[PDB]
Design a protein around this nucleic acid. Structure first.
Lengths: 70, 141, 143, 63, 201, 136
RNA sequence: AUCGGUUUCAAGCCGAUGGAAGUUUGAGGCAAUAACAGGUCUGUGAUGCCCUUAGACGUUCUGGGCCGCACGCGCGCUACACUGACGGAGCCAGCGAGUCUAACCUUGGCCGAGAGGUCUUGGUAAUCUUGUGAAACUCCGUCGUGCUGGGGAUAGAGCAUUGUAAUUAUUGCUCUUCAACGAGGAAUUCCUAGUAAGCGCAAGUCAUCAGCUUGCGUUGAUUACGUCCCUGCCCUUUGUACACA
């Protein structure tokens, strides 16, 4: 494919351990962990926000910023 | 037999006519509340005349702003100025010059367009250029 | 207690009126939908393509409300954007006629828009009622 | 890492091919009464502090 | 604090700005001081403001842009590489983002960290072409001017052909400049201009 | 799972990666607009990544691509309309693109039509100014 | 202007305050003496002379060419993308111009995916086009560092409009074809504030054709507030074998 950007239901399990203990979370960080690429990074952020491991500080389109759950 | 003063504020071809009248607190722009101005960052440029003195001073008036001309930013600066100039013109005429002084040096302490329009105007275009200065490229050889 | 179409935000209103006009199967779809890009000067069709139309319908409703009387020409030159003419400088080519005409006809049949004197189209009294009802719900849904 | 802060007391025209450098007279804030002549690059008013990485060497015009 | 009512209901977060303090709507200019002399009376952190956008008559006479709030000076210097010339609304939105970014990681109130980045990325001795090079000292206004012009150029060059958006890059550059790293087109690019100086100094 | 990569489709390799509306257009003879309209008539899901389309709906993609007029494509979405041979509107979607391109140039050169001759010489055929342009 | 500085306390200059405005307030128009063998005889029933004066070197008609392409150069436009593209929604200017014995600016409603057609309509115009609800811009979402959906060149077929006439494709529109281009060597241009730059808009030619110009607003920086280093300028001194210098 293109540097580990593949659709998976196991890297769901990889995400939901690796994403917490991040001081900062955004599309840029998710992709720069050689994970899910862009389209999949955004819908990962949206599901992590529904689940409530993420606190959204700002949610502007094109630049969504997030933090670890208190 | 009602306190009513028609003021205007302007920034580069943007005419914002405010109508500050004796009322409760109805501050509205193009028949919509100030809380809905097109640029959502310039929400705090239209608002700053209220946050400068306090909403307690606006607890006994109603303002209606009609904006025409310019672009989005020109129109926000026009509203901001029109509201501040409206409020000081009301306080001058219907309260006293003491409280007018008070909120004049309140408004001009935090730096101003706000009371009197920036003098700046566009310079006309002259031949052999794409603007007032920028000349076309020169071809020696 | 006097919430109108103007008292509510632009997008946050149109999105709730989009939900409402989709729940109701009352407003028509011209049939050529899925094969149009609502312009002469665009690249690709509307990305949603699940009847956007319910967003045009909503916005032409909200626009004709705020204005006095709007014609198809005002809607075309409104919705039309900058056409990339290739290597030549960008222009203004106005949006597609049929979409804006057939959505006005769809509002006319539903009873939102009324064929108005001075030409063009005004809002119906049923139109103002339905718009203001949604406009009140939108705000109190958050509150 | 000793960097010496010194306020300017007077500006003296401009040196260099162009007016890129301004010759200035500074007084050392630390252990004052010491007046030294120095070159700057950017625009200098009076009362402005410059950070010397050497308090020793004097300044000459840039012919 | 004193939640007043009007015929136009204002939200309480906006109503907590009236003479309370002027922030962005969250970043305070009480202040964690500039802390480095020579640049005090050259960084404006004394006049608090709501947005990083005034009409501004700051390029009027000579030294007037020293009495412009330093947040606007970044916001201004982010509009270069002239596909973004003008467009201050985009620039202030990027500034809003990068500030709440350098909040969410390494908080420190995201104005004093921006100020500290200006104090550290300022080239404090340079040279002049007199093919010779003569080492001269630097005016504190130019130390700010070039500190901004290194941070904001480094940012766009990093964010160019990348996934890291200008907001996150500028943010990372301001953080590593504040805490002297030499890993942000930063202290590295400044040391390169003080290295050519110490040759002739 | 069964997520495929290469996805061969009518004599081309259309990698079952990021998106399908944009994968189909790597076929020489369909574009972003046409691919989109065929995907819509195929009733495929567009958020899927071109690899998780089971072969039955891939066949239907190829069906509507090959014979578009049957499945409500309006006949102004096609390459050859009022074709010179018969007068029947169809879409040249496979290697037919260059096949019919060559056939048209060969038809023009056979007649010895001006555009055909300029096609033969490798000159620019749309009466463009080639004094200062088309160097290499 | 006032106040303070500041030069033999003279003309002035610098700083602060007030003021819409403190650079000649910003920008232009007008603009000397002398000069060029600068351009124009293709603007002129402006014109000397010379050439032709009907098998015309006059102006009319048909068609052709000014567009022809190994190559070089100058003004431009578009771009090499994530500060982005695309889709939706949000949605605001300023200077224009516009038809009677003619075909202008053209609302409005219908037909059409288009482009564009129809049947009416207001305007000889601060009344109508027209708020020219322009674009960049704003927000929500779809693309995720790949010549990629950046880029849109070349080509293929079709549908319209203008025009006696569209072929050497007028222009517009639809679908398909997708090239170079990963920020550019030696060089060189323009620019000091509502200016540069981005953005479009109106006017000129115009039946049709703007990637041009003349203007106008929209968004709106960085960096000087200086000096003769380069390239030239103005005044004085000085050397000269130069004077079409």
């Amino acid at each position: 494919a293109q540097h580990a950007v593949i659709l998976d239901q196991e890297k769901y399990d990889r995400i939901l351990k690796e994403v917490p203990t991040y001081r900062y979370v955004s599309v840029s960080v998710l992709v720069d962990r050689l994970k899910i690429g862009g389209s999949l990074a955004r819908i990962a952020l949206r599901h992590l926000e529904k689940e409530g491991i993420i606190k959204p500080i700002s949610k502007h389109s094109k630049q969504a910023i997030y933090t670890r759950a208190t | 037999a009602v306190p009513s003063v028609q003021t205007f504020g302007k920034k580069k071809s943007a005419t914002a006519v405010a109508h500050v009248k004796a009322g409760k607190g109805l501050i509205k722009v193009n028949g919509s509340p100030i809380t809905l101005v097109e640029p959502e960052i310039l929400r705090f440029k239209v608002y700053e005349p209220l946050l400068l003195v306090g909403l307690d001073k606006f607890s006994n008036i109603d303002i209606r702003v009609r904006v025409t001309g310019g672009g989005h930013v020109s129109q926000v600066y026009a509203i901001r100025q029109a509201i501040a100039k409206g409020l000081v013109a009301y306080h001058q005429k219907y309260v006293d010059e003491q409280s007018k002084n008070e909120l004049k040096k309140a408004f001009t302490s935090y730096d101003r367009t706000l009371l009197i329009a920036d003098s700046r105007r566009p310079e006309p275009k002259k031949f052999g250029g794409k603007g007032a200065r920028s000349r076309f490229q020169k071809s020696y050889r | 207690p006097g919430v109108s179409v103007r008292d509510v935000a632009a997008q946050d209103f149109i999105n709730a009126y989009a939900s409402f006009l989709q729940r109701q199967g009352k407003l028509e779809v011209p049939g050529y939908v899925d094969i149009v890009k609502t312009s002469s000067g665009n690249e690709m069709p509307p990305q949603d393509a699940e009847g956007w139309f319910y967003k045009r319908a909503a916005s032409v409703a909200r626009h004709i409300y705020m204005r006095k009387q709007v014609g198809v020409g005002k809607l075309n030159k409104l919705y039309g954007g900058a056409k990339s003419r290739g290597v030549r400088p960008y222009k203004h080519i106005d949006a597609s006629g049929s979409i804006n005409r057939k959505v006005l006809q769809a509002l006319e049949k539903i009873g939102i828009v009324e064929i108005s004197p001075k030409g063009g189209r005004r809002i119906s009294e049923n139109g103002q009622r339905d718009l203001d009802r949604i406009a009140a719900q939108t705000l109190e849904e958050d509150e | 890492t000793p960097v010496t802060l010194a306020k300017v007391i007077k500006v003296l025209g401009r040196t260099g091919s162009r007016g890129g450098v301004t010759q200035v007279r500074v007084e050392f804030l630390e252990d004052t009464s010491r007046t030294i002549v120095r070159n700057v690059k950017g625009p200098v008013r009076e009362n402005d502090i410059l950070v010397l990485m050497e308090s020793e060497r004097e300044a000459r015009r840039l012919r | 604090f004193t939640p007043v009512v009007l015929a136009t209901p204002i939200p309480e977060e906006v109503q907590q700005a009236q003479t309370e303090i002027k922030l962005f709507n969250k970043w305070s200019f009480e202040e964690v001081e500039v802390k480095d002399a020579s640049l005090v009376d050259y960084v404006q952190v004394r006049q608090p403001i709501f947005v990083a956008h005034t009409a501004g008559r700051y390029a009027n006479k000579r030294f007037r842009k020293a009495q412009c709030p330093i947040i606007e000076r970044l916001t201004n210097s982010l509009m270069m590489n002239g596909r973004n010339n003008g467009k201050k609304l985009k620039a202030v939105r990027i500034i809003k983002h990068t500030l709440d970014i350098i909040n969410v990681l390494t908080d420190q109130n995201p104005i004093q960290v921006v100020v500290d980045a200006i104090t550290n990325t300022g080239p404090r001795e340079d040279t002049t072409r007199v093919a010779r090079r003569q080492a001269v000292d630097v005016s504190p206004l130019r130390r700010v001017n070039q500190a901004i012009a290194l941070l904001t150029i480094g940012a766009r060059e990093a964010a160019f052909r990348n996934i890291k958006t200008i907001a996150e890059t500028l943010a990372e550059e301001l953080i590593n400049a504040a805490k002297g790293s030499s890993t942000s087109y930063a202290i590295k690019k400044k040391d390169e201009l003080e290295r050519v100086a110490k040759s002739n100094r | 799972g069964s997520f495929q990569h290469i996805l061969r489709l009518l004599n081309t390799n259309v990698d079952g990666n990021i998106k399908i509306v944009y994968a189909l257009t790597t076929i020489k003879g369909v574009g972003r607009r046409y691919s989109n309209l065929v995907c819509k008539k195929a009733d495929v899901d567009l958020h899927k990544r071109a690899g998780e389309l089971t072969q039955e709906e891939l066949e239907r993609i190829v069906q509507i691509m090959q014979n578009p007029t049957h499945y409500k494509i309006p006949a102004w979405f096609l390459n050859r309309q009022n074709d010179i041979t018969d007068g029947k509107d169809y879409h040249t979607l496979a290697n037919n693109v260059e096949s019919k391109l060559r056939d048209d140039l060969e038809r023009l050169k056979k007649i010895r039509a001006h555009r055909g001759i300029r096609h033969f010489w490798g000159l620019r055929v749309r009466g463009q100014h080639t004094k200062t342009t088309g160097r290499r």
